[PDB]
Design a binder for this molecule. Structure first.
Ligand SMILES: [K+]
Ligand SMILES: [K+]
Ligand SMILES: [K+]
Ligand SMILES: [K+]
Ligand SMILES: [K+]
Ligand SMILES: [K+]
Ligand SMILES: [K+]
Ligand SMILES: [K+]
Ligand SMILES: [K+]
Ligand SMILES: [K+]
Ligand SMILES: [Mg+2]
Ligand SMILES: [Mg+2]
Length: 1317
RNA sequence: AAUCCCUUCUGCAGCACCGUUUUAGAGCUAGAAAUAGCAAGUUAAAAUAAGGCUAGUCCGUUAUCAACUUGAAAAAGUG
DNA sequence: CAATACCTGGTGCTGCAGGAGGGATG
DNA sequence: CCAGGTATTG
């Protein structure tokens, strides 16, 4: 009674099957619990678990940081109001009270309804004088008169509440925003600065070029093109890119700018290369540009002046437009200016029409009339009838608002002393930001917090530097997320640029080098002293060590050789002692670097230089070693910084020692007799204690629950959910088998609204490219789902193999080609595809695109890569011909990869299963592997199905998952029975090119007959593995079984309370209050809450004026918001809902997808408290499935054999009317959608003359009507069938509730009809 | 299971711009009223998961969940 | 009550830490 | 986008 388990793991399903020795699926009588007449039921041991996808914690994060930002903006306003409190009380004792209650209706207000002044005359006068807040801001900046304290507060609060971005570190001169004069002065500085050949700025419109709204690099390209004799990589072009916003490097010219550390960066660069006024004229021009796009001798507040310009132009253009429409088109006036439902001005101001929609609506009306030329120019400039609060204000830096705030404070502190004293406090309120390396300012109740306090007191924007330890917190920010050595899980990894780590890497690479001379018969390793000599003579004198250097400067000059051959390294050594030479240049003391005593200190310094990024903290930590280096060396040292972390810790590299030998890993790597064992051999050697000590280190950390362990894997949270469910399914199956472990467990893992991503990728690439391909051809995200159009836009409308424009309309004429041919690699993704007019122009179809195409198109390809329209992998594959093209080894590897699962995630799943199955040790204290775990790629079973006609159709039902599992079980098991030597490739354990190509290509031919023998056996054992006369019949019978255990995981719904839309007030009890006292009838609110789970209530409710008690049984949906209160005390909750005399013990909790069975096997699932999903699977017989498969698609190019498939399709055409029949009988029994079924029958009767292929495809479409789960709309040819929904859950209150275990084999059935009174 | 770069998949932190909602921004004239004819419109306040106690410039949408017995829970046991 | 149609919150940026896989050694 | 909530129309 030996058995094996087959598993198919996916992101929404775990298919499972149990097989015996003969590849049969058993069947058992399983006990049934509950109050039903049924006491047991027969189940086949095969099925599939279905579940909704597990989501990422990202949306939670975004919304959580937003919650924090709203809290902190409120606290900003609260600080500002606290500063104003007393003097405002002297002026107006209820001003802030009216501000906070501005949202209430006049009936609910406690003070006068006019907020600012408290009476109508002064309010109307204010709005007449200051129609927008920016009028008041400009007035308060420019005027010299004492102003009302309330208007001052309103201006300062409007600046602080919407304060602009923080993308620039430094100050901003308010004026000097003339692009032209700053570019001219830059040109003068360069010309009189440089030695000869002065640059030309004659007839240049640096203003237009730089100020045009464009990508930084495209404006760079334009300005460079204007300059004769200047490269885009020219030094002056580099300075221009510095001024534009890019980071240039003057390293190559002489062998973001806004970062704060970037100025220290520039200072050390100046130390390295010894006039900079062009830089002081470069960032000045950067300001000029950035400011000029947004906005100076007439005011100190130019931003509010620009907003007032917006307002004035809006007024003038609106007057002109009203007059023009009244004169020329008097009949549309209402529609344009009164109808909020239309996208005219009325919908633009009061409706829901955006600026873009309003423009789309009014462009034809402007083109239709006369005198609309300037208005149309403003429209195409996106500068017509503009509001002031718009989407594009994200460009406004906080320095602008800060300048206006400071101006107002300077004006009004002459009249208000508390403004003079609190000026810097208010400025700080505006400018203060919590640093990213500090995190939440918590006190021990935030699982995300790491900040440590210098003193225990409340943190404010002003005492932040004294209360918050900006030092220790910035250290914790990195150290909490630092990686731990996998071998010693309680040790921190070394910095990637640590001297010890680089020594380790160099010695590990060097210890496997071999060399041959004439005197030697066979190659030899390098001795420890040879390796030390090579390190001291070469690695410590050159950054990179070439094989030529190894042959000449060592084997010739030391060992006195003339011809020696080297193996283990080719051309140049990959490892290098980079930090050694960095420090040798900085400190200039080789004996200090070579003194082993000085290792520690150095490891400290580098650690600092890696751990932090701030200059002050780095200097503070390096102070401990100030006495060791001259001041110049200390300044050069603090300017140097590293990033990145290694994979191994210091204790593993050079700490733990082998008990017998007494030396560390690095000691072995430096000298290991004549074995020269490397790191892997060291930690896997049974004669050394490294293996055992690593084992003893691992265990203590991994004593935690299965869920935590699976959380610690790397992968999508959806596939992690799948993995956890897979493990639980295996546990349940083992329990079903009488706690006997299986012989094999075969696992296969499937491969892994993105249209907006395509749109964003293309928009960014085209605007960075500076192309007008979207002005010429506007496109929507739905059109980008077509492969050819997406390729067209990614290629800027050009052929990729030949210099020639592409025509959009002729996309059907063109070809989509694989960069690496698909006979070699089955890559069908954008990363390996190209749109070209004719694939013939690629060159030869058997390799990488020819060298000629590369020579033609490399520059255009590089332009596409810089705009991120192609990836780096795509570019490399396109230009592989430059580096020899595809070698035969690549040919063999592309095929071995198609059939050997080499993912770390499938390896992790197999390791979990293996460590859960095999737990006993033998007499030699080695593991007893009772259970072998196999990992297969989906292509094996896919090719099996296609070769032996066991086709899958995903749309018919969810059975295929289960079937896949079964097939996986079968094939895998058979495979390792036929070729045990392949265990190393497929079974979890710590155990010519043409040859392996042929072998892996034909690995699955033992199943085929063509003459191979009828019976296939193992060569050595003589055991039978496959009977071609009997076992295929077994597989067919298994795939034809109608009873398959499909179980949809019942899940409590979590997440948001409801839809987020804040609806207008409405006389409906469906509205939910947004605050405790905000009656939705007066204020609006939310609707559409999500039911966490429903509850079966059995009680009485009052009926009629008499309040008589009437017995009821109904489903009450507990919403996500109600859940905590209902669970704290269900009886009080239900009584508050209106129920009386609740039968507490009859309360049944019903999560989403709870299963009910009614009459004639009709099943329903709970979609919520008031809707049901389809609960039955349509078990279509196998012959119909294979017919639908074959007839669904043409058979073209064993193409002569495909004639037999076509003849079978045509000989069994009557199958169509049978399939429809099978559907009809199903629907009438189970679905109960009379109108939809009649429409579908009429549609099938309508197209009986259509070709068989298209009828088959639309019949595939039909199964949406019968699929398990929520109803969905579908299409039969050109007829649309809307979903028939189940808008009532009354019937399930008398049906049979079915509780299912994870496999569905164990059940518990409750006949709810026995509940009532 | 080397380094570099790229891509993709994950986790955390700090910000910005809108959108919505109610109220404020005296609508006028003729109508009994409905309605008609005109004037106007760009701005602001406040909320932005109800809220919680642990009162922090903190926390509140991920992960986990058939039934039944035990347990605070994680989880074990039951065919 | 059952069929029918409509609805559904978005965008942009800065830093950091990691797993992976692909292609090459800048 | 999918699919559960909502009002409107019978
Ligand atoms: K009142
Ligand atoms: K040029
Ligand atoms: K609008
Ligand atoms: K090399
Ligand atoms: K760093
Ligand atoms: K959910
Ligand atoms: K959940
Ligand atoms: K279940
Ligand atoms: K990465
Ligand atoms: K790698
Ligand atoms: Mg709040
Ligand atoms: Mg607003």
């Amino acid at each position: 009674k030996k058995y094996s388990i087959g598993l198919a793991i996916g992101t929404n399903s775990v298919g499972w099957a149990v097989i015996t020795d003969e590849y049969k699926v058993p069947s058992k009588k399983f006990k049934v619990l509950g109050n039903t007449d049924r006491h047991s039921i027969k189940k086949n041991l095969i099925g599939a678990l279905l579940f909704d996808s597990g989501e990422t914690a990202e949306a939670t994060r975004l919304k959580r940081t937003a919650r924090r930002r709203y809290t902190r903006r409120k606290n900003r306003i609260c600080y500002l109001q606290e500063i104003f409190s007393n003097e405002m009380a002297k002026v107006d004792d209820s001003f802030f009270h009216r501000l906070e209650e501005s949202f209430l209706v006049e009936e609910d207000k406690k003070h006068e309804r006019h907020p600012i002044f408290g009476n109508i005359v002064d309010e109307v006068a204010y709005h007449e004088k200051y129609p927008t807040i920016y009028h008041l801001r400009k007035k308060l900046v420019d005027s010299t008169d004492k102003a009302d304290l309330r208007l001052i507060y309103l201006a300062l609060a409007h600046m602080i509440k919407f304060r602009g971005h923080f993308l620039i570190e430094g100050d901003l001169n308010p004026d000097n925003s003339d692009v032209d004069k700053l570019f001219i002065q830059l040109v003068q500085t360069y010309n009189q600065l440089f030695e000869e050949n002065p640059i030309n700025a004659s007839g240049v419109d640096a203003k237009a070029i730089l100020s045009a709204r464009l990508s930084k690099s495209r404006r760079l390209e334009n300005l460079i093109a204007q300059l004769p004799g200047e490269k885009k990589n020219g030094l002056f072009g580099n300075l221009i890119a510095l001024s534009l916003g890019l980071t240039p490097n003057f390293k190559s010219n002489f062998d973001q700018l806004s970062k704060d550390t970037y100025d220290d960066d520039l200072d050390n660069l100046l130390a390295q290369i010894g006039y900079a006024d062009l830089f002081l004229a470069a960032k000045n021009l950067s300001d000029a540009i950035l400011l000029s796009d947004i906005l100076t001798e007439i005011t100190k507040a130019p931003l509010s002046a620009s907003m007032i310009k917006r307002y004035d132009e809006h007024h003038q253009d609106l007057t002109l437009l009203k007059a023009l429409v009244r004169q020329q088109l008097p009949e549309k006036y209402k529609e344009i200016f009164f109808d909020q439902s239309k996208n005219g001005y009325a919908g633009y101001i009061d409706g829901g029409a955006s600026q873009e929609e309003f423009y789309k609506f009014i462009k034809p009306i402007l083109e239709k009339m006369d005198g609309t030329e300037e208005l149309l120019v403003k429209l195409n400039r996106e500068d017509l009838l503009r509001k002031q609060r718009t989407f594009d204000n994200g460009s406004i830096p906080h320095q602008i608002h800060l300048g206006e705030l400071h101006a107002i404070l300077r004006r009004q502190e002459d009249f208000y002393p508390f403004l003079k004293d609190n000026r810097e406090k208010i400025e700080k309120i505006l400018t203060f930001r919590i640093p990213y390396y500090v995190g939440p300012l918590a006190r021990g109740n935030s699982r995300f917090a790491w900040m440590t306090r210098k003193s225990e007191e409340t943190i404010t924007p002003w005492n932040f530097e004294e209360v918050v330890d900006k030092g220790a917190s910035a250290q914790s920010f990195i150290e909490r997320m630092t990686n731990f050595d996998k071998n010693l899980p309680n040790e921190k990894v070394l910095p990637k640029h640590s001297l010890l780590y680089e020594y380790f890497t160099v010695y590990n690479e060097l210890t496997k080098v071999k060399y041959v001379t004439e005197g030697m018969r066979k190659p030899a390793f390098l001795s420890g002293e040879q390796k030390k000599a090579i390190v001291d003579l070469l690695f410590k004198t050159n950054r990179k060590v070439t094989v030529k250097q190894l042959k000449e400067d060592y084997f010739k000059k030391i060992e006195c050789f003339d011809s020696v051959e080297i193996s283990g390294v080719e051309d140049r050594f990959n490892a290098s002692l980079g930090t050694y030479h960095d420090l040798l240049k900085i400190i200039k003391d080789k004996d200090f670097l070579d003194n082993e005593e000085n290792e520690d200190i150095l490891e400290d310094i580098v650690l600092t230089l890696t751990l932090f990024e701030d200059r002050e903290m780095i200097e503070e930590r390096l102070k401990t070693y100030a006495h060791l280096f001259d001041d110049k060396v200390m300044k050069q040292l603090k300017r140097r910084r590293y990033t990145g972390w290694g994979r191994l810790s210091r204790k593993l590299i050079n700490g733990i020692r082998d008990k017998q030998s007494g030396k560390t890993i690095l000691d072995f790597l430096k000298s290991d007799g004549f074995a020269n064992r490397n790191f892997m051999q060291l930690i896997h050697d049974d004669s050394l204690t490294f293996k055992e000590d690593i084992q003893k280190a691992q265990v203590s950390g991994q004593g935690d629950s299965l869920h935590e362990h699976i959380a610690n894997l790397a992968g999508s949270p959806a596939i992690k959910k799948g993995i956890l469910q897979t493990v639980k399914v295996v546990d349940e199956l083992v329990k079903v088998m009488g706690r006997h472990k299986p012989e094999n467990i075969v696992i296969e893992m499937a491969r892994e609204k993105n249209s907006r991503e395509r749109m964003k990728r293309i928009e960014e690439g085209i605007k960075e490219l500076g192309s007008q391909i979207l002005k010429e051809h506007p496109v929507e995200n739905t059109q980008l789902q077509n492969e050819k159009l997406y390729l067209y836009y990614l290629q800027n409308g050009r052929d990729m193999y030949v210099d020639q424009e592409l025509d959009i309309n002729r996309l059907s004429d063109y070809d989509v080609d694989a960069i690496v041919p698909q006979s070699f690699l089955k890559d069908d993704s954008i990363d390996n595809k190209v749109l070209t007019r004719s694939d013939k122009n690629r060159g030869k179809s058997d390799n990488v695109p020819s060298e000629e195409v590369v020579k033609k198109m490399k520059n255009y390809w590089r332009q596409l890569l810089n705009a991120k329209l192609i990836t780096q992998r795509k570019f490399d594959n396109l230009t592989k011909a430059e580096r020899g093209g595809l070698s035969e080894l690549d040919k063999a590897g592309f095929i071995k990869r198609q059939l050997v699962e080499t993912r770390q995630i499938t390896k992790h799943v197999a390791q979990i299963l293996d460590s859960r199955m095999n737990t006993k040790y033998d007499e030699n204290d080695k593991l007893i592997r009772e259970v072998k775990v196999i990992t297969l790629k989906s292509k094996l079973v896919s090719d099996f199905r296609k070769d032996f006609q066991f086709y899958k159709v995903r749309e018919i039902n969810n059975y295929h998952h289960a079937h896949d599992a079964y097939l996986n079980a079968v094939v895998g098991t058979a495979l390792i029975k036929k070729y045990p030597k392949l265990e190393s490739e497929f079974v979890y354990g710590d155990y010519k090119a043409t040859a392996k190509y042929f072998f892996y290509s034909n690995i699955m031919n033992f199943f085929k007959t063509e003459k191979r023998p009828l019976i296939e056996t193992n060569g050595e054992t003589g055991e039978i593995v496959w009977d071609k006369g009997r076992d295929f019949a077994t597989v067919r019978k298994v795939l034809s079984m109608p009873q398959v255990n499909i179980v949809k995981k019942t899940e409590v719904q979590t997440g948001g309370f409801s839809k987020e839309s804040i609806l207008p007030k409405r006389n409906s009890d469906k509205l939910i209050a947004r605050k405790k006292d905000w009656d939705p009838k007066k204020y609006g609110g939310f609707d559409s809450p999500t039911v966490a789970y429903s509850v079966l209530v059995v009680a009485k409710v009052e009926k009629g004026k008499s309040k008589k008690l009437k017995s009821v049984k109904e489903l009450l949906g507990i919403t996500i918001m109600e859940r905590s209160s209902f669970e704290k005390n269900p009886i009080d909750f239900l009584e508050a809902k209106g129920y009386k005399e609740v039968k507490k013990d009859l309360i049944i909790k019903l999560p989403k997808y709870s299963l009910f069975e009614l009459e004639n096997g009709r099943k329903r699932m709970l979609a919520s408290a008031g809707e049901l999903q389809k609960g039955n699977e349509l078990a279509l017989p196998s012959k119909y499935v294979n017919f639908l498969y074959l007839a669904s698609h043409y058979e073209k190019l064993s193409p002569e054999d495909n004639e037999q498939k076509q003849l079978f399709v045509e000989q069994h055409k009557h199958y169509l009317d049978e399939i429809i029949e099978q559907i009809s009988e199903f629907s009438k029994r189970v679905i109960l959608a009379d109108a939809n079924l009649d429409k579908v029958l009429s549609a099938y009767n309508k197209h009986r003359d259509k070709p068989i292929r298209e009828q088959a495809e639309n019949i595939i479409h039909l199964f949406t009507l019968t699929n398990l789960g929520a109803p969905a709309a579908f299409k039969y040819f050109d007829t649309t069938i809307d979903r028939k929904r189940y808008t009532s859950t009354k019937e399930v209150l008398d049906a049979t509730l079915i509780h299912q275990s994870i496999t569905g084999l164990y059940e518990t059935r409750i006949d709810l009809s026995q509940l009532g009174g």
